[PDB]
């Protein structure tokens, strides 16, 4: 019955509630950074490369 009390003490010693909170916060932060990056990327224009008006700001040099 002392084994049960010592295993209870071992559980309490091994558990770390602040580390659980930091694990939760890091999970939320990684997921939020993925979501933010993907939302910015999704402004994804698409025309042909010769469209000089849709690609007016690119620094392109032509040989013709």
């Amino acid at each position: 019955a002392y084994i049960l009390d010592f295993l209870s003490y071992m559980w309490e010693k091994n558990n770390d509630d602040s580390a659980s909170y930091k694990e939760w916060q890091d999970f939320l932060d990684v997921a939020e950074k993925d979501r933010r990056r993907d939302r910015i990327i999704a402004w994804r224009e698409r025309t042909m490369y010769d469209d000089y008006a849709a690609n007016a700001e690119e620094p392109i040099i032509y040989k013709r």
Partner: protein, 76 residues
């Protein structure tokens, strides 16, 4: 690709260059949006090419000439 057959350039090359210069100087982010602001030069280039409006004017004058000879045959 704009070189003339017996001359240095084609006969409507400068009209095309006027149109492309207008398209070059606009700032709209789409070609279809830029085209709405250069329609006068495109119309003048098409008139250089095929002369549809000069032909239309001559057809209208001919319709009036054919009308003033059938309905009007006045003798002296």
């Amino acid at each position: 690709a704009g070189m003339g057959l017996s001359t240095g350039t084609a006969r409507c090359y400068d009209w095309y260059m006027d149109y492309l210069k207008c398209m070059d100087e606009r700032k709209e982010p789409m070609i279809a949006l830029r085209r709405e602001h250069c329609l006068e030069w495109l119309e003048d280039y098409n008139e250089c090419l095929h002369r549809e409006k000069e032909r239309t004017r001559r057809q209208v004058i001919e319709r009036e000439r054919r009308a003033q000879l059938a309905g009007g045959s006045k003798p002296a």
